[PDB]
């Protein structure tokens, strides 16, 4: 039962930005958003993929375990960050087809479409989820709830650590498709959770950009309204 | 073998504070120290015990998971929240609940300072004859960084988390505070700063004291070592 909240709107007009803002707290069923619409369309993940592949990663033994360091030397948390093309699209492959398909399928991520090749789907392939999917997704992996073990969970959650305060942690991770055009503008992503206290909120924000120099909006607005809400106050 | 790096000293006398700085980087194969002398002297953990009083709590299940919240009416606070402030009474129950048999079970298993926990269970940390060295307290954070203490895997990442204190692009740092209070004349209290910083693919480990008989220093138990490993290119300034 996700409410729309035209007050955030303010934020996209200021910018003139096409995009929505899903923002839950304590759980995905009390979730807000400034465009109910687009909140449940489906898009290319992009980076935000690196969540999922990272964690069935761990899981299949492709990664080692915390300390795995991948040769672009970069740590989970740094090949997390950073474009990293080669480390995730060298994930996927090793994971293979078969396990992939497998572990969307129990996370109940997007439309599981891997199609489009397997060290590039999320990129350039058919995947496609939703700003509502993700912080349902996200909620899994806070719960601990995903079908892996919970050292997995809780190495990916510890990675995702974009943010340090002393009343709140901030887990975050950024998406970006690329330009594209008018007629099928390109996404950029910016999902996650703050642990506040004793509660949580989780987001997930994605927007149409057509230039890069609108990047920084994917963070900007989605702080601004967290802000507001006396979250992170960023 | 520790060495010791004389430079260090410079910013000890620069606030006319007594103390120790041990950093190591990778292992503790590898370290450097302001005193040598200093660095193998035990002293009281004082809330720095919250490390491995965490970790037994979830390995005893005395603390349920990493969502456990602990209790004008202050709010319930987090397992990150109850270890940052003092929330003594709340570790105070951990270690009632735990007991005297486990606790020196663990301490020993974690060759956790002198495993002194005689004078009352809830309160040998804070008063009692329990004492560890800065070097100790690097080996323990060690351990639980390679996941090589007696205890999962998994209760060793809640807590290795919930200690993150500071995260840029380049590091995450990992650190507990510590202080006895201000002591007395012959005999003043000590204040603590551990921890580990992992930047890139490398990781620093570091545990300091002072002596402090005035809460106006404290500050420097953050700013002594933030400086000495600022200037080592660890973390920013
Ligand atoms: C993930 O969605 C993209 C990419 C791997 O497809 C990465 C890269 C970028 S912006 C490009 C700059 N690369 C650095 N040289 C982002 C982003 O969302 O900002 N994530
Ligand atoms: C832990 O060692 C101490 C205390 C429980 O003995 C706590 C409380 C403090 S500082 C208390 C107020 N000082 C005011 N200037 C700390 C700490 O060292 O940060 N931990």
């Known amino acids: 039962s996700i409410t729309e909240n035209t007050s955030w709107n303010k934020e996209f007009s200021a910018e003139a930005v096409n995009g929505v803002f899903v923002l839950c707290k304590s759980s995905s069923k009390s979730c807000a958003t400034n465009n109910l619409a687009r909140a449940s369309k489906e898009y290319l993940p992009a980076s935000t993929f690196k969540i999922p592949s990272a964690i069935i990663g ?16 970069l740590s989970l948390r740094g090949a997390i960050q950073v474009s990293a093309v080669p480390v995730f699209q060298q994930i996927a492959r090793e994971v ?34 939703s700003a509502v999917n993700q912080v349902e997704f996200l909620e899994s992996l806070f719960l601990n709830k995903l079908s892996a073990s919970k050292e997995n969970q809780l190495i990916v959650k510890e990675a995702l650590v974009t943010e340090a305060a002393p009343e709140y942690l901030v887990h975050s991770k950024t998406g970006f498709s690329g330009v594209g055009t008018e007629s099928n503008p390109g996404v950029a992503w910016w999902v996650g959770w703050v642990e506040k ?38």
């Open 58 to 73: 761990l899981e299949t033994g492709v990664i080692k375990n915390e300390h795995q360091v991948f040769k672009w030397d």
């Open 197 to 234: 206290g004793t509660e949580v909120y989780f987001f997930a924000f994605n927007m149409d950009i057509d230039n890069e120099n609108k990047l920084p909006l994917r963070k900007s607005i989605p702080t601004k309204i967290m802000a507001s809400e006396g979250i992170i106050g960023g």
């Open 96 to 129: 293979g087809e078969v396990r992939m398909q497998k572990y969307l399928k129990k996370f109940s991520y997007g439309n599981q479409n891997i199609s489009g090749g397997i060290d590039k789907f999320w990129l350039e392939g058919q995947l496609r989820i």
